[PDB]
Structure formats: C-alpha cells, structure tokens
Amino acid sequence: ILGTGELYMDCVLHDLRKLYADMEVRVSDPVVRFCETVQDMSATKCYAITPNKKNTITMAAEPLDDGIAQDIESGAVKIKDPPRKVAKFFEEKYGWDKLAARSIWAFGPDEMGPNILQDDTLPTEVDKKRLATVKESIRQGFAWATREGPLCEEPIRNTKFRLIDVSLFPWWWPNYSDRSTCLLFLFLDGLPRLMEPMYSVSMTGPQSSVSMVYNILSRRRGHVLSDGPIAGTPLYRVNGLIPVIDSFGFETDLRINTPGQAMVSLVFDRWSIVPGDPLDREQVTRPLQMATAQATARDFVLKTRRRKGLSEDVTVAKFLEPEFYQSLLESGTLGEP
Amino acid sequence: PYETMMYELWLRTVAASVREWDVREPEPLIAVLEAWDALLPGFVRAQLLRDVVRKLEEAVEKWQPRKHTHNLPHRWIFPWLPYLPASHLDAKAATGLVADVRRKFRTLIDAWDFSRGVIPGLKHWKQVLWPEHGRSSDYWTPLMMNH
C-alpha cells in the first residue's frame, strides 16, 4: 500500500482493520518507494542480438539535464505535440541540436514520463520503413523495460537514450526481453544510482522550537532551507528538506521534544540522490543496524531486492549475451563478478 | 549557558549566511570562520562544516562539467579544502564532494572531445584525489587511465 504520509496511512489502516476488512492485519515497518537514475554517460556502446539472430540493437545512455524531467512531468512538452514544436522547445531551452531534438522518439514509461529515447542513427545506414516497424517495437519494449530497472525493480528517472549506428533491423520481432535486457545492462554500464523521495519540512512555532528543529533535522539527515519570522505574529516558520524514510516519526519527535508547540507539515517535494553507490561490493551493513553514510544506497537496494524476492546481487551474466559478456570481461570495462 | 547561547544564535546566523552567500566566493565565509573559530564550540563548528559541505556538494552536482566551465569547481573547493571533513575529502568514498568531483571528471573525460581541449580544474581535482601512499586508495590514476 502506497500513501502520502503517516496520518494518511494511519487512517487507511484504521479503515482497513475496522471499516472494510473487519479483521486483524499484520503491518510491516513503513518504507519508501524508490527510483533509479544514472550520473555518468555510457562508456561502452552496448549491442544486443535477437534469439533468432536477425536483428541487432546498438545504443548508449546518458543522464538528462536539469529541468527536463520536471518540465516533461508538468507538461511543457508532450509526446502528442507536433515534433517541430517539441524540437523547437528543446533546442531553445536546453541548447539542443536540431537533428537530435527532431530525432527524439520516446517518452517513458508513459506519455509524461521522465525518460527519453532518441535515435542518433543515420538514414544512410538504416532504412526508415524497417526502422519504423522496429521503432514501434522499441516504443513498446522500452516502455515495458523502463518500469522495472535493474537495481531493485523500481522505476527509473532522468535518463536519455541514444540509438547509435551499425545496428541493423531485418523484419519481424516477437520478443521484448532482449532489448529490455540490453537497456538494463546499458544502465549498469551507465553506473546507476538510487533516488529517494524528499519531504519539504515546514514548521511553525517559537524560537526554542526553531533551535530544536535544527537539532532534529541534523540527526535525521535533513537541512533547513529557510528560516524566518511570520510578520505580525510571535511565530517563526522554518522550511527544510528531509527524506521520507528518515522522516518516519519526525513530527512526533519534534512535538514531544520542543518546549514550545511546533506544528509540522511534511509534503513530497522531489527525488534526490541517496548517498552511496549501490554497486559497491565493499560496503557491508550489519543486521539490525543503522546504515552508514557511504553504504546507504547499497543497503537500500539489497534490502529492496530481498523484500521483493530477487537475487542477492545484480547479475551481469543474466543481463548480457554470453559473447559480449565475455568480451567486456576480457576488456575490463566491467568489474570482477 | 554561554556556549549553548552562542551555539544557537551564532550557528543559526552562520547557517543563514552560508545559505545566502554564493558558493563560488567562499573567501568571506572562510574569513568569518577563521575570525570566530576561537569562540566557536565543536558542535557549532561541525554543523557549519556540514552546511558548507552540503552547499559544495550541491554546487558540484548541479554544475555541468562540460557546459558550466565559468565557475571552476577546483577554485570553488580550494577555500574550504583545509576545513573539509575526512569523509567528504576521501576520494575512495562512495559519496562526498571529492567523490562527486572524481565522478564529474570521469564523465567529462568519457564525453570530452579532443577539439575542446583539456578539462579545467582537472589538475587540482587530481591533486586533491591523488593519495600520497597507497595503490588501492589512489582513485586518480585508474579513473583517468580508464576514461
């Protein structure tokens, strides 16, 4: 069950136990819905060959620039807008090439999703009609694959794809998991990161209360964005930022610790990068124990995987063709398994 | 009592100044820290260092390595280099200002064309991220040779 906050889920679970289901329900500790992203562009132009060895797909991935995901989520551009207007918007706002901006194919996972797919392919090497049929296949295959993501099967944000040349597309393809698989390994080569939701904190209260807010946010890995008086009142309003997973219990702790009376609002603000690298095999977290500042992403992704029932580690061999897997293992682009 | 009053008032004022001031010119903030560091308690100093490290990491993450080359990250992080924490300054760390700088340098090296020239600030970034002793802890040579 996914909901907005502590009071929201308290009301929901009350209505589940007493109002609708009318029984006793075991309820877990609360956790957050994660997201995925990349921070470095793809170094190896990754390719995939069909099970019948007819078609081949070659591409790379890249982090998006700041503001594209928020503008596409708000609705500055649409996948149903005219392509000339879409290209004009990207070229004007983000300094984008006209060819690339016209070559933007896909918004994923949905029409207003935060991932984009563009072909850098050359018409001199790719015939457009076969490119059109396999393009619709890539539309829906990329849409299928971008809900999951490789790290913890949580949807991926802030991603650009560039379909590179040489990839040839003969007729007919009924399988989807293959270019899903090369998108996943392309993420691994893009060296992904995990993203957590952020609450904007906003409290109102006296000055002893603002001092206690600074203290409690310091313990709970948040920070104070702004801090001011409210004109005409003896009140002070303090805005800040905190993760949801660290804000569980934040309101109750603040209200029972402040000597005045502080009133707290926790709203969803944005997705931010969780500290740590999710693929660092060195970082180990003890059971029952607080994650360190460096092992936090690793701890989150392992426990998400074990909660969902996935394998204990990311499987590059499962996420690759054996030939290209062995070739990249020989080349040393990937680490030791 | 004086220590806690100084903590509350002075650390709140220093955090407000750190939030208001520009990241690219840390000389006045460093001068304020050097002047008031005699009476500054350890808790207030740690909180102010955390705020400065957060501002520097935010600037390093937001600044485009290929495009926004006007504000040099090395020159921006030079003023707070001696007061930076070990966890942030550790290049081997997964998260930190030094880790973000190394990742940005690796990304710029991977997506850098020969026509644009060398990456600005990469020399001081490699000087910061190059360990004096230890082959396994040197994150400068391997990332450079791989990117």
Partner: peptide, 28 residues
C-alpha cells in the same frame, strides 16, 4: 570535534540564560 558535534548524545541539550538581577541578589 566533528564526531562530538554530530553525536546525538554528544550534541548537548540546551537551557536558557540566567538572570543578572537574581545573581546580584544571591550574592548580596
């Protein structure tokens, strides 16, 4: 210094300032 600053036990709980008139009255 940073460990004692960031330590939730080591970050001390605060209390308010004194009264100078009360201190002078106590001395008198």
């Amino acid at each position: 210094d940073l460990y004692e600053g960031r330590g939730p036990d080591d970050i001390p709980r605060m209390k308010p300032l004194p009264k100078l008139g009360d201190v002078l009255q106590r001395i008198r």
